[PDB]
Amino acid sequence: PGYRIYDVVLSPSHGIELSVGEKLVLNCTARTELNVGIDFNWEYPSSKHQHKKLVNRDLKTQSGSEMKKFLSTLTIDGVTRSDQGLYTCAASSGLMTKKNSTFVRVHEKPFV
Amino acid sequence: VQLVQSGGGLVKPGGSLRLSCAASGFTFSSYSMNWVRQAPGKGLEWVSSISSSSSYIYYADSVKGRFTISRDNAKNSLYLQMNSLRAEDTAVYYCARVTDAFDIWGQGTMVTVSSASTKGPSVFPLAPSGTAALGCLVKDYFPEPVTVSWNSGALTSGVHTFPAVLQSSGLYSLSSVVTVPSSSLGTQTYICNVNHKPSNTKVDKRVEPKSCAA
Amino acid sequence: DIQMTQSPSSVSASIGDRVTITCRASQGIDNWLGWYQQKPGKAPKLLIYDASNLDTGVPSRFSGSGSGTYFTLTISSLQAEDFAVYFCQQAKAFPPTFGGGTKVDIKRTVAAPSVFIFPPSDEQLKSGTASVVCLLNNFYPREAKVQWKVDNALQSGNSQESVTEQDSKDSTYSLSSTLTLSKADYEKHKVYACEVTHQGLSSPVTKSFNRGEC
Lengths: 112, 214, 214
Known about the structure:
The structure holds 3 protein chains of 3 kinds. By secondary structure, chain B is an all-beta fold.
C-alpha cells in the first residue's frame, strides 16, 4: 500500500556557520515508502545562481524493509553576505508534501 | 495562502473544458497540487495529483486516459484539460494543495455536462383535495435555474420551493408547494409565477381547488 | 482499493452538546486519516489530519482519535458555526478515498410530517406522461422513508426524492417524492398510494387516491 512520506531531514541539522568564502553543503534526506516517487525543491535567499548549478542532479536512492531514501544536496562553493538567510528543502510526491528548513550564516571575514 | 479557480460551466458530451487554478500567498513550485470533485449530493471524489516539477502524476481510474493535469510554475497556476466528457462528470471540481493532507482548497467551479439544448418548463398544477397543501410542478427545463414566486410576492409564509432534479431524459424538474388555511380556498386565489431566464419564459399558472382526480 | 464508511448517517445536536462521529476502513491505514468540514455552498475546510492533529486555525473544541481501521472525531461543545457536514479521508494507498459524510444538524422534538398526495393533472396527461407527487411537509428527523404503491405494487426506480435545507424558523425539513409513469402506464391502474414511515408516527401513514374519483 504506500504513497506516504515519513519525514524530511536536513544535514548538518544545526550550527550552520560559514565565513565569507567557504563550501556550503546541505543534505536533504527524504524518507518514503516503497511505491513512492519524490520531487525536490530548494528555496534560498540569493538570486545570482541557478537551481541546476547548486542543487544536485543525480539520482541518490536506497531501499530497505518497507521504506526508502531520497537524497538531494544544495552546494554553494564560496558564499557572500547576500547568501545568508533561510534555506528550505521541499519534497513532493503527488499525494503528499513535506519540507524542512535551516538558517545559514555568513560572517564578513576570510577562510583558513 | 489562497487558491482561486476559473472556467467550468456548460458543455455537451464529448466536448472539452479547461479548469485553471491560480495559486497565491506561498511558494507554488514546492507543493503537490491535486484535483477533487463532488457531484450533486455525493461524496468527494479525488480526481488527480501532480508533483512540484510535474515529474509524477496520478489519475483516478474513472478519468484515466481522458483528463490531462499539468502546471505552469512561472504562472503559479494548476490546470486540468478535460476531454472526452460524460454526463457522470457533471460535478463541482476543486483544486487543492496537499501537505500532509488537503489543507488549501479553491472556491470550486461547477461543470455541468449534458446534451440538452435550451428549453422552458411546463408548469402543471398540484391541486388540493386542518390546513390544505397545494403547489406547482415546474417540469422539463434546461439549463438551471428557475425562479418560483406565489402571487408575485403576496404569499411567502408556508412556501416550499424544492431543489431541481436532473431527470433521465437529461432535463430538470422541480416542485413548488405551499400549505395554507383550507377555509380561504373558496375565495382566495393562488397563482404561482414561474420565470426561466435562459429560455426567456415567464408563466403565471393558477392552481384551482379540485375534489376530483382522486 | 480502500472503502471508507462513516457512522451514523446524520447526528442531531443543539448548542452545547458533545458530538461524536465515527469512520471505519475496509483495510488498515495506521494513523493517516483526515477530517474535513463542509457547509452548504462552500469548499471543504481541513479540520484534522494524521488522526488527531488540528490544522493551523482550527478551534481546540474539535478533537480526533483512533487508529488502524477504526477512527473517531469529537466536538466538545457545539456552536452555530459547527452545523455542517463532516467527512473522513484516507492517505495510505492511492487512490485517497473519502467518507460518505455526516451532516450535523439542529436538534428538536420529534415532529410528524403532514403528508399530501397530488394526482397527475389533466393538462399534463394530454402530453403522454404522468407525474404523481407526494409531499412530506415539516418534520424531524430527516430520516424518512417513502414507499409508492400502484394497485398494491411496490414502485422503485421510477420515483425520485428531493429535500430542502433546514428552515431557520422551526428547524424542520420538507420532501417531495415524484412517481413518473407514461400516460399509457398510468391509465391502466386504479389505486395510487404513498406510504411513509417516520419517527413521529405510531405506525406507517398512507395517503392514497383512486384515478379520477371526486
